[PDB]
Specification:
This is part of a larger assembly, with chains A (403 residues) and B (76 residues). By secondary structure, chain A is of the alpha+beta class. Chain A has 15 helices and eleven strands. Chain A has a six-stranded mixed sheet, sandwiched between helices. In chain A, helix 9 packs across helix 11, helix 9 packs across helix 14 and helix 10 packs across helix 14. The radius of gyration of chain A is 23 Å and the shape is globular. In chain A, 46% of the residues are buried. Chain B is mostly helical and 76 residues long. Classes of the chains: A alpha+beta (403), B mainly alpha (76). Chains A and B meet through strand 7 and helix 15 of A and strand 1 of B. Cardiolipin (CDL) binds next to helix 1 of chain B. Chain A: It is a peripheral membrane protein.
Chain lengths: 403, 76
């Protein structure tokens, strides 16, 4: 009984997708297939710095008058950038649907990058990075990406190195903007109280101008030892399947089974036919090795001794999860934008439920043995990590002598 | 034990998986140069004592023989 997500396509290739609902406020966003993976180490912070500059005024709406408009209807303006996708989204009322779309049009095209602003946003970005190091789990996940995807464009961070940040100019930005903002790589997603025909007419009216035009995991280890920190963050991952491979669903159930360290989180990060599947835990130094041992045992148990009850529990946790999420308008629009960018279509919740209920214990331990057993992991540690075991002990913990 | 051995700071340490790297990277490529590099930093400290051991050993042997060799002048 969930309403279907209807997708149309303009000549430009900008797929305009919408999923109407009763709620009177909507989350209209633009999703662009452009991240740090498309950068070539000479413009490693171009997407981040453009994400900073995108709200500082356009040609038609110069400066803060633009954001005065998004204050005037009381709407909320957000943007984010990952290694593969960039999103500019607005939460607003339903009756303010046209102007919001027009605002989004300016943000993607006709944007103005002021040289004055460029210096101010450089100091913002530089400073934030200079303090970003504070967030450990971000440092650990960046270290994990770097050591797992050495030599590839997937190792480099979204923010880029301070070097590039300082060394960036309007023209470079202009390039990234004019290169990675093509209309066939763009989705206009709407969720909530929107009509699809009105949104399609608004996309035809504005946004109809957008121009139309080997990933490798390396089993490795990075250890940033700094003994003055009170807690240690350790992430261990193996290679993921990618977006389009359905056993992701089964792997999600495996994560739902795992769900000793103060904080233990499992992740399945997916990129275009690659990814990182693993666990991040933050712990006191004198516990670290025991955690690792614990964690590896659970993975091998999922490779060898999965039972039906924990599989049923993981399926229930996954169902609830995906359905708990996909609740508010934003979460949904976000799903529409990512689904049109990655799968090329919006997968409905009934298909997700079918793919969940076809998962049993035998195929779960088969897929877990395919992806976890006897695999070389990527390890990233930060903090008092002397008792964190080196690569032979972790690699030996990636299998059992008793199977 | 591990964890309480020492205090270091800001020393990042990168590494690779055994199966991901060649087993004998440039083994004879640089091994020979290095072994030779090594031998030339230690040969002057090591070798001349054993050289003079060889000279003393030979000397002793020959001297001993001469010692044993009958004195021609004697017994005549
Ligand atoms: C010289 C020509 C070869 C060459 O240039 O290669 C570079 C290489 C030197 O490389 P490097 O970068 O200078 O040092 C890193 C080592 O290669 C890293 O390897 P390593 O040589 O340090 O290996 C540890 C060492 C450990 O040695 C021991 O375990 C010694 C144990 C005690 C002595 C033996 C017991 C009996 C003692 C009776 C007295 O094992 C060896 O000494 C070599 C074992 C060879 C086994 C047979 C292979 C065929 O030369 C050798 O490895 C020589 C040994 C092997 C021949």
């Amino acid at each position: 009984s969930v309403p279907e997500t209807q997708v149309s396509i303009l000549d430009n290739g900008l797929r305009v997708a919408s999923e109407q609902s009763s709620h009177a406020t909507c989350t209209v966003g633009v999703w662009i297939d452009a991240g740090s993976r498309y950068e070539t180490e000479k413009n490693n912070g171009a997407g981040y710095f453009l994400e900073h500059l995108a709200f500082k005024g356009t040609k038609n709406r110069p400066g803060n008058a633009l954001e005065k408009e998004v204050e005037s209807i009381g709407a909320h303006l957000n943007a984010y950038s990952t290694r593969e996708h960039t999103a500019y989204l607005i939460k607003a009322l339903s009756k303010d649907l046209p102007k919001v779309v027009e605002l989004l049009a300016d943000i993607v095209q006709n944007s103005s990058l002021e040289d004055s602003q460029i210096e101010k946003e450089r100091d913002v970005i530089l400073r934030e990075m200079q303090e970003n190091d504070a967030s450990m789990q971000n440092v650990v996940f960046d270290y994990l990406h770097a050591t797992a995807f050495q030599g590839t464009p997937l190792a480099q961070a979204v923010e880029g190195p301070s070097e590039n940040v300082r060394r960036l100019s309007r023209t470079d930005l202009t390039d990234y903007l004019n290169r990675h903002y093509k209309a066939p790589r763009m989705v206009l997603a709407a969720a909530g109280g929107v009509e699809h025909q009105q949104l399609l007419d608004l996309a035809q009216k504005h946004l109809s101008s957008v121009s139309r035009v080997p990933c490798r995991f390396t089993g490795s280890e990075i250890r940033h030892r700094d003994d003055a920190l009170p807690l240690a963050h350790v992430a261990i991952a193996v290679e993921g399947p990618g977006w389009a491979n359905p056993d992701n669903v089964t792997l999600q159930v495996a994560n739902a089974i795992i769900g000793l360290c103060q904080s233990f989180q499992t992740f399945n990060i997916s990129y275009s036919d690659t990814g990182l599947l693993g666990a991040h835990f933050v712990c006191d130094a004198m516990s670290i090795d025991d955690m690792v041992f614990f964690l590896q045992g659970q993975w091998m148990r999922l490779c060898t001794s999965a039972t039906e009850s924990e599989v049923t529990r993981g399926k229930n946790i996954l169902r609830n999860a995906l359905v708990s999420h996909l609740d508010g308008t934003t979460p949904v629009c976000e799903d529409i934008g990512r689904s049109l960018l990655t799968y090329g279509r919006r997968i409905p919740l009934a298909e997700w439920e079918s793919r969940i209920q076809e998962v049993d214990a035998q195929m779960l331990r088969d897929i877990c043995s395919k992806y976890f057993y006897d695999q070389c992991p990527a390890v990233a540690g930060y903090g008092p990590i002397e008792q964190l075991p080196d690569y032979n002990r972790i690699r030996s913990g990636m299998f059992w002598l008793r199977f | 034990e591990f964890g309480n051995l020492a205090r270091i700071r800001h020393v990042i340490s990168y590494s690779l998986s055994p199966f991901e790297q060649r087993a004998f990277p440039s083994y004879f490529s640089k091994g020979i140069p290095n072994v030779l590099r090594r031998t030339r930093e230690r040969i002057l400290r090591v070798a001349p004592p054993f050289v003079v051991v060889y000279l003393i050993y030979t000397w002793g042997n020959q001297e001993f023989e001469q010692s044993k060799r009958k004195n021609p002048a004697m017994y005549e």
